């Protein structure tokens with residue numbers, strides 16, 4: 001009873017303090033800084049989904065090994081999501097984001113120089129473990145600086161960088177890989193592509209070193225003075241940028257809540273116990289129903305999205321093969337599909353707070369479900385490309401709404417743990433969807449459509465039952 005009341009008081013005072021600081025230069029600087037990490041996540045997603053099948057160049061491996069390589073990095077990302085999301089609730093958002101990005105950058109760098117399939121597989125697995133933390137940490141980290149007024153719109157604009165990362169990866173695949181001359185004694189061009197894909201995470205580390213830790217984490221962990229200094233930094237930056245530097249931060253006091261390797265082991269066991277306690281508390285009676293409905297929504301949406309997104313270019317390739325019998329194309333098709341997301345991002349960001357998260361999610365899910373039925377009439381490659389663009393454009397709004405809803409439905413001391421668990425479930429659903437949808441390619445275009453449509457309808461029916469979070473302080 002007591003702790004919940006104190007945390008509600010803290011939430012209200014934190015809302016009041018963030019209204020004191022206002023929204024401005026600081027939040028947009030942080031927006032770009034974390035956008036770099038979302039871009040790194042998008043680059044990793046593209047590489048794993050479309051290139052890691054050794055599409056043209058590596059080719060030193062059997063087809064079964066191509067499938068394994070194209071999939072187990074998703075297991076790495078699942079493990080990373082759970083690990084870093086759990087740890088960020090105990091060690092801090094900035095700390096865990098820095099360590100996760102350092103791991104990703106280091107092992108991506110290593111994967112460029114390895115000489116064998118197995119070591120490359122291992123390096124990409126660890127890079128996926130590293131990058132898995134970006135989404136759950138980034139979204140909570142940014143949300144903890146936002147007032148309720150336009151929180152949904154501000155979070156929705158964040159997803160632009162994931163699309164930018166996908167576009168970057170596709171364009172770099174187009175530019176670098178075909179240029180086999182960009183090699184030296186053997187340092188083939190795929191090494192250059194792998195190396196250049198690591199730049200966004202290095203820039204993310206560099207930029208992130210400049211930003212402060214989340215003050216909400218400090219207040220939730222008893223460190224009043226550090227949170228006060230960080231909040232005064234936010235206020236002073238925003239007022240200086242707005243031409244009112246003479247304004248003084250009025251906040252006085254903020255409510256707050258409260259051998260070497262053997263010591264390391266003790267610390268590790270304590271941290272594991274705390275993370276497991278948070279995860280289990282996510283299933284307590286006060287969050288049980290929300291947690292299960294979110295699990296279902298996330299799983300069904302991820303299954304449909306990833307299965308269909310990988311199925312599309314394979315179907316286009318099969319159509320082209322059948323036409324001929326009567327790589328670049330995959331990269332260009334993925335590039336167009338990633339570009340098609342931009343209008344949906346713009347519209348959903350502008351309308352998130354106006355129409356609400358629940359209606360956005362349900363309407364976008366229904367639109368995706370009905371646009372799945374159009375694929376029965378995909379009579380040509382042009383039609384299939386157009387329908388891929390349509391599906392992505394309508395579906396991305398569901399993801400934006402789900403991100404905002406996941407941020408707002410959980411408390412600050414569980415936010416990254418719950419988000420990491422749900423994102424690991426998302427990556428598991430991605431693995432399952434890719435594996436199942438790959439089997440149907442060329443055999444039928446009924447099974448994948450029915451699977452995706454049913455999953456989306458189930459997701460919509462589950463989404464319609466979640467509570468509305470507008471007009472409420474960030475619990």
Ligand SMILES: CC[C@@H](C(N)=O)N1CCCC1=O
Pocket residue numbers: 038135159162305396399400403
């Ligand atoms: C950060 C973007 C991310 C998300 N919403 O979590 N997206 C976009 C569609 C596929 C996906 O996972």
